[PDB]
Design a protein around this ligand. Structure first.
Ligand SMILES: CCCCNCC(=O)NCCc1ccc(S(N)(=O)=O)cc1
Ligand code: NA
Ligand SMILES: [Zn+2]
Length: 258
C-alpha cells in the first residue's frame, strides 16, 4: 500500500489498486437534506459506551486511531437501522488544512472542518477482519466538527498528539470516555456504503448525526501539527486526509427525524 492523500497517490489514484473505488456503494456521499426521506420504522439509536475501555492512540500515517478493547461487549452500538450488536473498535478523524474543508460527508454540499468516525463491527462475524468482508459487517457513526467553542471531551485527545507526531508512533490512552465526543441529539441519516480509505470495502452501514459538535480553532490547529511521515523523514503535515463525496448511484439516504 502506497496510497495517500497527495496529488500523486490520492483519491483519484486509488482505483488502480482498489478497483472497488468505482463501486456501487462507495463512501462518503453528499447528504441532500431535501431528498433524504424520513423513515418512521427506524428505531432510535442505542449508544452504550458506559463500559468503554480505551487502550492506545496510534498515528498510522493516514489519521490517528484511539483504540478500544473489543474482546467483549463493552462499548456497543445497536438500534437505528441495525440488526444485532456492533462493538466499538476505534475512532479517528478526518480534517482539513482550512476550517472550510475536512469532512468526508457533506450536507447540501457543505463541508465541515472535520469528521469523527466511531467504528464498530458486527459481533455475529466474530472479529473485525471477518466483518469487513460482509455487507453488514461495520457500522460507522459519523459526527461533524465545526469550529467555534472548544469541546471539553476532546482535549485529552488533543493533549496527547505531541507524543504521536509521526507515523508508527503510539501512546497509552486508557480511561478515555468517548461519550464526551457526542452532540446532544442522536438524530441521524443512514445509508449503505463503504470504508472511505483503501481497501474501500463495501461493508459499512453509515449513521451520520445531524448535529455537529463544536471544537475550538486551537483544537483543530493541533490536529494539523501531526505528520503523515515517519520520524526522521521529510515533514509532511497531516492535513486534508479526507476522501471527497462519491456518486450516490442506486441508494436512498434515510432520515431518523422529520
Ligand atoms: C485479516 C485482516 C485484514 C486487515 N484489514 C484491514 C482493514 O481493512 N482496515 C480498515 C480500517 C478502516 C478504514 C477506514 C474506515 S472509515 N474512514 O470508513 O471509518 C474505518 C476503518
Ligand atoms: Na478561536
Ligand atoms: Zn474515517
Amino acid at each position: 500500500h502506497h496510497w495517500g492523500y497527495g496529488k500523486h497517490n490520492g483519491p483519484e489514484h486509488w482505483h488502480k489498486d482498489f478497483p472497488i473505488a468505482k463501486g456501487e456503494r462507495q463512501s462518503p456521499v453528499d447528504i441532500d437534506t431535501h431528498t433524504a426521506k424520513y423513515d418512521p420504522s427506524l428505531k432510535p439509536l442505542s449508544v452504550s459506551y458506559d463500559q468503554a475501555t480505551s487502550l492506545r492512540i496510534l498515528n498510522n500515517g493516514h489519521a490517528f486511531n484511539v483504540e478500544f478493547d473489543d474482546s467483549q461487549d463493552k462499548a456497543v452500538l445497536k438500534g437505528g437501522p441495525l440488526d444485532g450488536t456492533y462493538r466499538l473498535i476505534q475512532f479517528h478523524f478526518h480534517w482539513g488544512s482550512l476550517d472550510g474543508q475536512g469532512s468526508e460527508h457533506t450536507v447540501d454540499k457543505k463541508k465541515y472542518a472535520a469528521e469523527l468516525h466511531l467504528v464498530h463491527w458486527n459481533t455475529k462475524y466474530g472479529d473485525f477482519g471477518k466483518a469487513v468482508q460482509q455487507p453488514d459487517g461495520l457500522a460507522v457513526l459519523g459526527i461533524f466538527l465545526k469550529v467555534g467553542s472548544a469541546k471539553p471531551g476532546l482535549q485529552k485527545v488533543v493533549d496527547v498528539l505531541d507524543s504521536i507526531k509521526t507515523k508508527g508512533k503510539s501512546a497509552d490512552f486508557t480511561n478515555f470516555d468517548p461519550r464526551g465526543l457526542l452532540p446532544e441529539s442522536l438524530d441521524y441519516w443512514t445509508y449503505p456504503g463503504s470504508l472511505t480509505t483503501p481497501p474501500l470495502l463495501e461493508c459499512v452501514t453509515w449513521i451520520v448525526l445531524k448535529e455537529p459538535i463544536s471544537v475550538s480553532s486551537e483544537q483543530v490547529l493541533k490536529f494539523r501539527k501531526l505528520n503523515f511521515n515517519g520520524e526522521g523523514e521529510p515533514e509532511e503535515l497531516m492535513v486534508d486526509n479526507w476522501r471527497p463525496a462519491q456518486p450516490l448511484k442506486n441508494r436512498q439516504i434515510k432520515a431518523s427525524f422529520k
